[PDB]
Point group: C4
């Protein structure tokens, strides 16, 4: 085994082809399936895994009540091969209400945060042993990506925040060799509020498209130099913006350097990536709530903050159906690195009151240089007909 360098060009991408879907909530109506949220996909050199933070209970279970709450001591990082639903034989790989995982080509890293809000612990697990931990620095919800970290040459980088979800916070970027923290750099550049980063390799470094939970409906971008540990940061230029909430396409604007200040409060984890001066991105279809999901390419969207020229829209989940988090993951091919993404399909509370629980299922798409058509792959469960 050798380390992953990801030293290959990014695949041509004309859009995205259907890759996976686990019908988890549908299955949980006549089967024992975990209650989860904040899923993500990451792959080893051979195959892909679906990860999620479980709520320490199955769906049909009295303990599914109040799973709307996102940090308890019962939450663990669940790990299956992609498309194996989270049944009872699933491995809980660490204790976590916030995580990130990646494979460096030799083994798995998990970064798992659990504990008190004001005094959380991050565990660093490499090759199924605990190799390090770090305490919260700002004593206010230590939290990380909820999607894959990125390793190059045996150095994994990951992005962590501690501090306000509505004001300056302390974002750091950790550099990990075999589960050992070898460096911590602090967020630098003009990105003002960075959460829940979707990172992807972009040799020779990593790039991340995050959530601005404070004053932005544009998403931040963090670049990480893996060799000198330097950081830079800014925002996705595209005039069509990628956060929810946001302003409609006719009213919306952006900036390459600052939060656009447009319905900036709150957000949702999402992703984007560059393709020369254009940008690929997904977002909820509905501007104010997490309904629907679509991807498109904004032409000049990476370098021109006035560009509102999209093409190649695909509906992934139609606007009448629920979405949630999304994130990127990268997959090595023969000649090129491909880009894929998952969409968390959230069902239950608070939005939907006919059940007492909150959970999700997922749908995953991947980049293609070929052709594709259309459709919509929502969750599909009838909550009117699920357990009392």
């Amino acid at each position: 085994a050798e380390y992953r360098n990801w030293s290959k060009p990014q695949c041509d991408i004309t859009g995205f082809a259907p890759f996976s879907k686990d019908n988890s909530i549908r299955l949980s109506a006549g089967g024992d399936i975990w209650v989860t949220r904040e899923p993500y996909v990451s792959c080893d050199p051979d195959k892909c895994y679906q990860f999620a933070l479980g709520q320490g209970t199955t769906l049909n279970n009295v303990h599914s009540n109040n799973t709307v709450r996102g940090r308890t001591p019962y939450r663990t990082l669940l790990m299956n091969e992609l498309g194996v639903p989270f049944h009872l034989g699933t491995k809980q790989v660490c204790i976590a209400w916030s995580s990130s995982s990646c494979h460096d080509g030799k083994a798995w890293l998990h970064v798992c945060i659990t504990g008190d809000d004001k005094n959380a612990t991050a565990s660093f697990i490499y090759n199924g042993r605990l190799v390090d931990s770090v305490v919260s620095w700002s004593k206010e919800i230590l939290r990380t990506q909820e999607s894959e970290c990125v390793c190059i040459n045996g150095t994994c980088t990951v992005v962590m925040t501690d501090g306000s979800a509505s004001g300056k916070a302390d974002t750091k970027i950790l550099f990990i060799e075999e589960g050992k923290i070898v460096h911590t750099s602090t967020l630098s550049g003009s990105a003002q509020h960075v959460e829940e980063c979707s990172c992807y390799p972009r040799y020779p470094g990593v790039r991340c498209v995050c959530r601005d939970n404070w004053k932005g409906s544009n998403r931040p971008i963090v670049d990480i130099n893996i060799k000198d540990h330097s950081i830079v940061s800014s925002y996705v230029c595209s005039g069509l913006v990628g956060d929810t909430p946001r302003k409609n396409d006719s009213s919306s604007s952006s900036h390459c350097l600052d939060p656009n200040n447009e319905e900036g409060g709150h957000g949702v984890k999402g992703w984007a990536f560059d393709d020369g001066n254009d940008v690929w991105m997904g977002r909820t279809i509905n501007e104010t709530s997490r309904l629907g999901y679509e991807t498109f390419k904004v032409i000049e969207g990476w370098s021109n903050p006035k560009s509102k020229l999209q093409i190649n829209r695909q509906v992934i989940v139609d606007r009448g159906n629920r979405s949630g988090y999304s994130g990127i993951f990268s997959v090595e091919g023969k000649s090129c690195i491909n880009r894929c993404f998952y969409v968390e399909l959230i069902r239950g509370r608070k939005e939907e009151t006919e059940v007492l629980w909150t959970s999700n299922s997922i749908v995953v798409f991947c980049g293609t240089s070929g052709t594709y058509g259309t459709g919509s792959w929502p969750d599909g469960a009838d909550l009117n007909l699920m357990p009392i």
Copy 2:
């Protein structure tokens, strides 16, 4: 590992011996089992896998209601080792209401079609990653084999159809190397309507026995040349016909070049293969609906449309029990390649109205050069006692 060439002669067949049976519906009255249809079997160099298209629900479950419907966004391809029932830990390998898979010797290829009826997408997945896709070309249910594809020296071939199910359609033969579509031939020769091909390697090429849904109750054959990508086509000569519906053994007739026009409308997926000038084949026992299943050899049935002389008949499923799709798979022995087949056992709607679901179990048999007896292996579930 090495590429499969299939470059050994076909085994002697004196008939087929019992190989596998999953008792899926019988288990689902006391277990969480998937609801499926369009199953099939394919094997890697070491062992055999059973596939089916899920309905994104288990049987005992509110979402099993109305799974008579064959194309929904919830359908996925399920893959277990052969003889492992589709329990809740079964892997969904891709999104699909129509699929074909095969192993080229080094890795699996899955061909997976989902999306809108008029704008469906085929995904190609190889060694666990999405390598290609293609849009529907004629905007009318892009569909494929529902049984193993076939790979020779690195090149996998698959047959796909887009268009009318009761008139001319556009059928093509894709050539795929490591999941990459490298060439695309159009259906050629005298086969007028082609669906749901059962293909096998017949070195140096591939042969398929398909379902003419339009004007034939005889079965199309398609020869695919893997090196120059050429395609010839015709019908199964044998005067005993393999489609359902069809006319009885007395009235029935055929033709080597054209559909017979005998209750030719509609059909059922099936197989047949050549043994010199004789043909081994299976079919439902009943002439007009999917009841029973039988196999025999027709002496000169491969090459003489007037041949109505069968021998070595075996009842696989008796005429009072439901049957369904059936297809071929091939397995490499020490010195020869063998031919096996599965038979889908369909239970539920529309035919059986005591339940709201439609699902199936499978039985599987393999070519033997030894001797054998008699029996019947139906589904064995009591729908009158089932999860009501």
Copy 3:
């Protein structure tokens, strides 16, 4: 991977020590467990597996009513690692209402009989594929060991029988190289009725202790010579006899050559093995029923049909608890071949009417050269309380 040849002397044995227990019936009161009978154990060069003949249903399931019936088309051979009970992701490896399996050093052989009573088929599955098959020769319930077959230098051997359960029958011994029946010797010697041989390697040949269902309560021995294919047979001398029914310890008698003729009709599968002129053996504790199970050594019991001198008795199952079939398997150690045995713990119909089903669980012991205490390890389910 080399072929096993068992060319090491038998281990010293002082008795047997607890090895494994699957608690299958106790679990199926609150989970999905298969209904089974006719279990056995065989091991690959690394680990052991447990087998049984499924009834195509789980216990808590409408389909388990009437599982007293030992031959249906829904029966399949189950295979897990030893100690993994037969839950829903258990692999069915073949269609079988009678079977035998073994591993030859490189791969599994499985011998699986199913079909009509009057015309059953044996299928021979090696290294994942069907390689051969035979019809019933005498058209009366073709059947085989229900326990491990034995392979030496790549030749496996299995004893099968076709014919009357209660008068002269046709017993053959097949030799199988890589799934291929390379020879068939007919039964020869003194043994007059032979069923369910529990065989073991005894380099350079194989030995079996069987069940006489006709006029013997002494158990038959069958010697199989693997190079010349010759067959001798006789009975186990011991004045203490293995079969059930039998006459009590005071009244019983035996013969090194002929059925002893005492309550001989009917029987139960069991085992014994020589140790110089002494014999190790197990048997039920009730002389008339499949209640309890014991093992002891009979001093000179292997060459003196007058020896009723036992020692080293162990109760495996106490006398007020149900037992059933029992069988030997062999396990290669560093310097010697050890011998072990399993005991089928039959619960339900017809002997127990609180339930509708019939099933078993199993307990497994292994030869020890060290020391050991006492106990009882019954099935332990409360049928007064199980599923309706």
Copy 4:
């Protein structure tokens, strides 16, 4: 594969970071989970496994009633990967109401005890086969560690006791090479009563911190020399003592050589390990009950029996929540041997009467040299609401 030698220095430890949590009881409210007790953790060279003793039943099962009882014939050793809860595909690896397992770098040893109280058998199982066994020596509950044994250069050591739980008993230390008992040394030195050793490698020896069920609320220490099988023993000096019951902190005292005589009757399996002259240790938070769990370093606690100077307390389970047994396990990192521990979270009878059953879940922490914060990770099931 070489044998583990553990010839690495012990890791710097500043405290413990969360590693794993199985949520077993929470899950059992809506799934098929095993009833267990006396859990522990042990790792092969790659990954950790969670072991426990089952009660031969699942929780939502009639047979969970009276699982308070700790030696039945239906108790088996359960073994999964760490994080996979004990569902029905869980392997039972031997018959046990008492056990110890370790990996020597080449394979697994399991030491398994079952049988009558007055006449129990210990079976030694290595590389998946029975290699040895030993009878009870004092004919009064032969019993062993309930945590990992330790192997150095292929010689594994284990600690077993037989005799009174409240008076002088007969404690032996066995030495086992690939399954074979090669030596038995007897306990020696000043420890007067020794149960349930939590042992760990301390090159070139092995060191255990045990439970005095007689007169000591300080914990016995046993040292084991592996080359010449000599044994020394004593007690943990620390004035803060590990056992439950014990005296409160103000009132307690200890002794380096003798049971302290302070509420000695009874106790609980627990652990400790030296760090210079300092001691790391855990214990229940409540002095008299198995409520809560905590860890700390006692400054000079290893050599100064009057030290009561704790630092680096961590709460693992808050004091309003139930704990239970705990023990150590060692994981080899790149340059040092780490120390970890697991805590049994007992729920149900007799302490809690809302349910008829007794079971547990587990939490696992591992030593860290990094930093960490605070929390509490209890069982989290609600019995007011569980099955029935």
